[PDB]
């Protein structure tokens, strides 16, 4: 009955609020009407004058924009002409280098890579020797390491059997009564919660 | 209660671990010896050959570095001159643009700003006329709203006190017996809980 009576206090509040919301909206709408009414009178000024002035405003900016566009176009032509001539000259100077210095770079690259090839050839040969030596050393040792690891694993497993058998059985032998004692507490605890929560 | 039994089992596993550690580390060290010495067989040749590899490699790289460095002297240096003249030309091209177009942009700015002067000032003044009416409406509706809010405040306060009294009465009149009931449930709960956690 707690929530039932408490809800009544909430319901009455809603009723009181609803009876107040009426006048609230009535007066608020009334005040809003004056607000919008004023804004309407203002709209007949704001938009009216902004439209009456939008003509000379836009025409002014447009006129000047046209001048700006004309001036820009009157400049863009000779400017592009200068840029084009300059570009041709500058690009030509670049071509005067891309060709000789380009071939020079290619010719030097020939030597660069040729020396590299003549270096990589014996290098890789010796690298193969290194790999052969390293892999073989790691192989002979690898087999021993694997054999040793097998022994270590064998000893690990045999000792693990001291855990998988005795220790595990011991744990189970402990778990059994542990679970039983836990069952006792769990059973009573469940009764406890149920006795108080219901 | 049987933690001693479990702990002993853990102790046994620790001893078994040590029984492993001894032999395992012994052969592991023997393994490490094979690894260290084995790796040394590789490392000796590796390091010795590294000397016979890095020396002619740095030399080869230095040769290429010279070709590249000297190459850059016959490329970057003259190109710096080509680009210098090109930049100077471009700067001249730009200077002959930033001056006329620069003052032109300023003239445009003058025409736009002066326009904005007679476009923003008069408009803001008209906006002042509008804002005055807007604020006047807001002040009127605000004055009314202040009264409405004041009235509604008293109406809401009366409904609040009209609720607070009986609500607090019923709430306390509910809390009093409910607390006693809660105490009973809590006392029985605690009393029995300590019995299970005994
Ligand atoms: C059937 C279903 C029923 C439904 C349930 C309804 C029943 C609920 C019943 C009662 C609720 C009322 C709450 C208790 C009344 C508060 C009394 C009060 O005024 O108590 C203030 C104390 C703070 O101590 P003090 O400094 O005043 O005292 C030390 C004084 N010496 C240092 C200053 C001098 O507070 C305390 O006792 C309270 C604990 C500490 C308060 C810390 C402040 C917490 C603030 C905000 C938490 C907001 C979480 C929201 C964020 C979520 C984001 C997602
Ligand atoms: C239909 C169902 C609808 C849903 C229901 C909604 C729930 C509403 C009901 C209950 C809410 C539970 C909260 C009650 C807690 C008490 C608040 C209060 O009363 O605490 C008074 C104190 C006085 O200050 P002190 O230094 O002595 O206390 C400092 C003391 N210590 C440090 C312990 C805190 O205040 C403070 O602690 C800090 C507060 C400062 C307040 C300044 C007021 C400024 C004026 C106007 C702000 C307008 C807000 C508009 C929102 C409308 C609200 C109706
Ligand atoms: C201390 C005393 C404090 C005084 C407190 C004042 C309380 C008055 C305020 C609010 C009344 C709360 C009413 C709650 C009752 C439940 C109504 C209901 O049956 O609720 C459920 C419905 C439907 O579920 P749903 O649509 O939410 O879920 C959508 C999710 N799906 C689709 C999965 C279903 O929810 C809906 O109908 C959505 C309802 C959202 C409407 C909230 C009320 C907004 C009121 C005013 C807005 C302000 C206008 C002013 C601005 C004008 C400036 C000129
Ligand atoms: C939420 C927490 C965030 C808080 C941050 C913001 C606070 C700052 C305060 C206010 C700024 C809010 C402005 C954004 C306006 C909301 C727009 C919106 O998201 O709206 C949604 C509503 C809901 O409906 P709907 O979208 O489902 O339907 C339309 C769809 N259809 C086609 C499907 C059926 O749309 C409607 O109610 C329909 C609208 C009908 C338009 C009528 C226009 C009448 C003309 C003039 C009125 C005069 C105003 C005077 C100026 C006074 C300024 C003080
Ligand atoms: C007294 C009262 C006066 C005060 C007024 C002052 C303000 C007036 C200013 C702007 C209002 C615009 C008026 C609406 C009228 C038309 C709108 C419209 O439709 O005009 C169409 C245009 C063009 O479109 P079109 O390609 O079809 O025509 C191009 C076709 N030709 C090339 C192919 C041939 O469009 C446009 O002018 C669209 C430009 C606007 C861009 C909107 C997209 C926004 C995108 C994302 C929202 C991001 C929010 C970011 C938040 C972060 C903030 C930090
Ligand atoms: C951990 C052992 C302790 C070592 C110490 C004692 C030594 C014992 C003696 C010898 C060791 C023998 C080594 C054998 C281990 C190889 C494991 C392996 O080959 O694994 C990779 C496999 C790959 O998957 P798949 O090809 O079989 O499946 C694909 C299935 N499809 C395609 C078929 C359907 O995965 C599997 O077999 C999944 C097996 C998941 C194993 C989870 C073990 C988590 C234990 C500890 C993590 C934390 C260590 C940090 C301790 C910090 C202490 C401070
Ligand atoms: C002293 C200590 C001892 C010494 C130790 C060092 C030993 C290391 C040994 C050899 C180095 C080679 C490493 C990379 C292995 C792959 C070699 C190979 O078979 O590669 C083939 C690729 C394929 O290219 P494609 O022309 O057939 O395909 C063009 C296709 N389409 C046109 C559709 C775009 O060739 C490429 O990625 C390269 C061609 C693209 C050129 C890119 C620019 C590179 C910049 C500077 C030259 C750097 C030389 C340094 C070596 C690194 C090479 C990546
Ligand atoms: C001892 C050895 C010395 C090494 C010296 C090397 C530098 C000396 C300079 C020049 C001569 C060597 C030339 C090597 C450069 C050419 C790389 C190349 O063959 O490029 C071709 C790619 C093709 O693109 P795609 O659209 O046809 O393929 C997209 C189509 N799909 C997706 C199907 C594949 O790119 C293009 O053609 C676009 C070209 C963009 C330019 C890339 C140049 C990158 C080089 C260096 C910048 C590094 C900055 C790192 C900073 C660290 C400093 C320590
Ligand atoms: C239905 C509508 C009716 C109106 C309801 C009025 C009745 C009150 C009823 C219930 C309580 C509502 C809950 C208030 C919310 C708690 C806010 C809070 O947690 O507040 C304390 C915190 C703590 O920081 P602090 O105090 O050290 O810093 C203050 C900094 N200070 C000096 C620099 C400016 O403050 C902050 O987070 C900083 C924010 C402080 C803002 C103060 C606002 C001052 C404005 C006007 C004062 C008007 C009083 C007239 C009352 C009108 C009755 C009709
Ligand atoms: C860590 C990230 C680095 C990224 C850098 C990106 C920027 C690239 C832009 C321009 C190229 C670099 C242009 C470098 C110009 C050198 C500028 C210079 O004087 O630098 C000095 C510093 C010294 O630092 P310290 O901390 O040692 O001492 C600071 C000192 N006390 C102080 O108060 O300043 O040394 C340095 O950091 C610079 C080392 C220069 C050695 C190599 C000089 C290069 C010479 C020739 C070029 C040959 C090109 C070879 C490459 C071809 C391809 C294979
Ligand atoms: C009457 C029965 C009713 C039944 C109740 C059933 C439910 C019980 C469950 C929850 C209710 C308890 C709710 C307790 C809420 C505690 C709220 C609180 O103030 O917490 C703070 C403490 C802080 O401890 P620390 O004090 O040691 O502080 C030092 C801190 N680092 C510093 O620099 O200052 O944090 C801690 O409590 C944790 C560390 C505690 C250290 C001591 C830990 C000591 C723990 C146990 C005691 C020894 C066991 C003896 C055997 C008896 C059992 C048979």
Which atom of ligand 2 has the smallest separation from the CA of A14?
Answer: 1
Residue B23 CB: number of other CB atoms within 10 A? 12
Which atom of ligand 6 has the smallest separation from the CA of A149?
Answer: 10
CA distance to A163, A175, A176, A183, B137, per residue, from A179 (Å): 21, 6, 5, 6, 80
Instruction: Considering only the beta carbons, identify the residue of A35, A41, A90 that sits closest to B86.
Output: A90
**How far is it, in rounded angstroms, from Cα B164 to Cα B156?**
12
Chain A positions touching B138 (Cβ under 8 A) are 35
- Per the CB < 8 A criterion, the answer to whether B56 and A111 are in contact is no
* Ligand nearest to the backbone CA of B186: 11
Residue B135 CB: number of other CB atoms within 10 A? 13
> How many whole angstroms from B69 Cα to the centroid of ligand 10?
15
Radius of gyration of chain B (CA): 48
**How far is it, in rounded angstroms, from Cα B22 to Cα A174?**
31
Are the beta carbons of B119 and A53 separated by less than 8 Å? yes
The A residues from 73 to 132 touching B (CB cutoff 8 Å) are 75, 79, 82-83, 86, 89-90, 93-94, 97, 101, 104-105, 108, 111-112, 115-116, 119, 123, 126, 130
Give the 3-state secondary structure percentages of chain B, helix then strand then coil, rounded to 5: 95, 0, 5
CA dihedral B37, B43, B44, B47 (to 10 degrees): -160
**How far is it, in rounded angstroms, from Cα B186 to Cα B193?**
10
Instruction: Considering only the beta carbons, identify the residue of A115, A126, A156 that sits closest to B49.
Output: A126
Q: Which two tokens stand for residue B147?
A: 């009264």
The closest alpha carbon to A16, from B116, B7, B160, belongs to B160
CA distance A185 to chain B (A): 6
b/e map of B69-105 (b: 16 or more CB within 10 Å)? eebeeebeeebeeeeeebeeebeeeeeebeeebeebe
Q: Which two tokens stand for residue A27?
A: 């007066």
- Please enumerate, as own/partner, the contacts of B145-152 that have beta carbons within 8 Å and a separation of 24 or more: B145/A28, B145/A31, B148/A24, B148/A27, B148/A28, B148/A31, B152/A20, B152/A23, B152/A24
Q: Which two tokens stand for residue B197?
A: 């956690």
Burial tier of A107 (Cβ tally within 10 Å: 0-12, 13-18, 19+) = exposed
CA distance A151 to chain B (A): 9
**How far is it, in rounded angstroms, from Cα B102 to Cα B96?**
10
What ranges make up the beta strands (E) of B6-72? none
Element (H, E) at B59: helix B3-73
Our CA angle for A33, A35, A39, nearest 5°, is 110
Q: No. of H helices and E strands in chain B?
A: 3, 0
Hunting for tokens 């003549």 — which residue is that?
A: A118
């Amino acid at each position: 009955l707690k929530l039932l009576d408490n809800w009544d206090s909430v319901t009455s509040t809603f009723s009181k609020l609803r009876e107040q919301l009426g006048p609230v909206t009535q007066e608020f709408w009334d005040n809003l009407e004056k607000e919008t009414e004023g804004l309407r009178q203002e709209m007949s000024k704001d938009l009216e004058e902004v439209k009456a002035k939008v003509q000379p405003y836009l025409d002014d900016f447009q006129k000047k924009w046209q001048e700006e566009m004309e001036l820009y176009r009157q400049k863009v032509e000779p400017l592009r002409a200068e840029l084009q001539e300059g570009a041709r000259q500058k690009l030509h100077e670049l071509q005067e280098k891309l060709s000789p210095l380009g071939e020079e770079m290619r010719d030097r690259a020939r030597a660069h890579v040729d020396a590299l090839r003549t270096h990589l050839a014996p290098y890789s040969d010796e690298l193969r020797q290194r790999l052969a030596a390293r892999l073989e050393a790691l192989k002979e040792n690898g087999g021993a390491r694997l054999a040793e690891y097998h022994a270590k694993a064998t000893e690990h497993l045999s000792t693990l059997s001291e855990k998988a058998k005795p220790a595990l059985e011991d744990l189970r032998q402990g778990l059994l009564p542990v679970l039983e004692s836990f069952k006792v507490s769990f059973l009573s605890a469940l009764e406890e919660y149920t006795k108080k929560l219901n």
